[PDB]
């Protein structure tokens, strides 16, 4: 029924993880591995089509990645941080459960007396969450601009996810459930979001539709050290949800496919991918990718991608994008920009 | 006379339902001081920290199979039965809890799924320390009074028992440095418990109480003061109490411009449940009538971030609250951040 009219995009950046690693050098550490359980397949770079992923330097956390994004952001809204009202974490990854990346980040960049704070945490939509809480806080008057930060660390998943699967013992199929945490990826993105009359040529952030279905909370189950995921199954109700969620959102958006400029989506893999695309009748061209050299980078994916497009220039004036993604809950959230 | 802005504050929401749930296992400070007593002893340690000075006497702990999620759970049923409404009507839930089943997914995703709550049921977390539950209510206050939903349910189960053996486990070391002793020594004040809240627009349930929302400080230079994983809490206990009041007070300026509060003109405080220190020293930075703050660390110790609802809940179980009683919550999280709400009965 009633969308946002007054929340704009005033800023927003990206850090690409200096480090590459190859699902090629990878392979090679794992072929003994392979050799014993008899796969002769290439999960990684044939069938999830994930070629190279980023790892930070070492003893990189979140909230230094968070930081670096947000100081990206702040520059590309071409605001001082003293304007900050909220700051909102959005990362997975999190330096500590007390207190929040949010308040480390917010102290780094020295955020004022007056800035709010806190971690949102919801698998791969929660940038999307973080946003749409930032909005509504927007548009109530409270704040005037807002920082939404995401930064990814996977660098220690591949220390230990690698060594437990290359140790003389070994199981079975785990394997499986555990080659998920090697499509992961490091990453950061932020996000200066603002009232605008304050930005009146700036993108807007209509807001969107949440649907889920939670049901299916067992699916993937990620600790620091550890992600074990059904893939398979997560793939297809995803896909039933997402239908769901998209006649949702016709109804409060007022969308349909043949009218979006962009479908910005979380990044898992060419399977998830394409099992999308198929199911909706997408043009493949109007559905950035970056899983092929940067892995899955969770909640970051999605201001990852936008913020690639805009600086590629992809993106006019006038352009209508859906940010959508399918996270672990199950949960599902889709959202318009007008650019 | 003269018309005045709402300050921002919340209109028309209110709190529908509202439960605790005590952890079943009793831990006293004095067993825990049988089995410190050698380190004690070791490090010239001549006076009871935990029973006297902090003035925890015992906490309570679940089983140690038991998960932040499951507590969020029991909490919510009683909630929702306080509230007199089933789970279909549960637009939103927010898990605002410290402790965490896994980083992904969501607690509120695993609490959603035991409930069973529609596919139009919004779900994420909020970590804040033990601020939390506050910014929930905010975040769903928000919602609510937008008119986006009609129910809301912010749920928190905080579990401390590994954090427990583990600190126990290094306090009682033969090399344990004084310095890592007293950093440890805070989260042997923890305690187990779950909370949860209905809230809703106010149309719906007439008579409950209204949640008017309030104001926010921040000091973020002293994120490093307090800092937890799973099995370890560090804490300068000394600069959170000193940089706590300062931002307390910072706050009750603000509370007076934007709630008109005074400190004679309330009825309740609901505080942080840290100890008998801090709680003395925020009554008397303030001028506070003890009587006025309800504690419970002395039985349960510091439950984080379900401490505020805890109190509420409890308030209302002992028959404290009556009509028109208007109520501040305050709240000190590590940070530091610094809420302060009011809440009219």
Not at 33 to 44: E, F
Not at 81 to 105: F, H, M, W
Request: hydrophobic share 45%; net charge negative; aromatic share 6%.
């Amino acid at each position: 029924h009633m969308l946002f009219q007054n929340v704009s995009i005033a800023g927003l950046a990206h850090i690409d993880a200096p480090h590459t690693l190859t699902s090629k050098e990878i392979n090679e550490r794992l072929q003994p591995t392979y050799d014993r359980l008899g796969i002769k397949t290439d999960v990684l770079g044939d069938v999830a089509g994930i070629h190279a992923r980023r790892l930070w330097d070492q003893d990189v956390q979140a909230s230094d990645a968070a930081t670096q994004a947000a100081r990206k952001a702040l520059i590309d809204a071409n605001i001082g941080i003293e304007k900050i009202g909220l700051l909102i974490n959005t990362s997975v990854s999190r330096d500590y459960l007390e207190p929040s990346t949010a308040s480390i980040v917010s102290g780094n960049l020295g955020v004022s007396d007056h800035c709010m704070t806190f971690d949102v945490a919801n698998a791969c939509l929660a940038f999307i969450n973080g946003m749409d809480i930032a909005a509504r806080m927007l548009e109530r008057g409270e704040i005037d601009y807002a920082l939404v930060v995401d930064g990814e660390t996977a660098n220690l998943v591949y220390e230990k996810t690698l060594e437990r699967m290359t140790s003389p013992d070994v199981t079975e199929e785990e394997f499986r459930n555990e080659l998920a945490a090697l499509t992961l990826g490091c990453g950061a993105a932020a996000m200066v979001m603002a009232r605008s009359e304050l930005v009146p040529d700036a993108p807007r952030y209509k807001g969107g539709v949440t649907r889920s279905a939670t049901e299916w909370n067992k699916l993937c189950r990620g600790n620091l050290d550890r992600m074990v995921t059904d893939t398979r199954l997560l793939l297809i109700e995803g896909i039933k949800l997402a239908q769901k969620t998209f006649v949702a959102a016709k109804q409060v958006l007022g969308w349909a496919v043949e009218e979006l400029d962009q479908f910005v989506i979380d990044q898992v893999s060419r399977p998830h991918t394409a099992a999308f695309v198929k199911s909706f009748g997408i043009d493949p061209a109007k559905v950035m990718t970056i899983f092929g050299e940067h892995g899955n980078i969770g909640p970051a994916s999605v201001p990852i991608v936008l913020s690639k497009l805009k600086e590629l220039g992809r993106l006019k004036k006038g352009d209508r994008i859906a940010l959508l993604g399918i996270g672990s809950g199950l949960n599902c959230s889709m959202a318009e920009v007008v650019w």
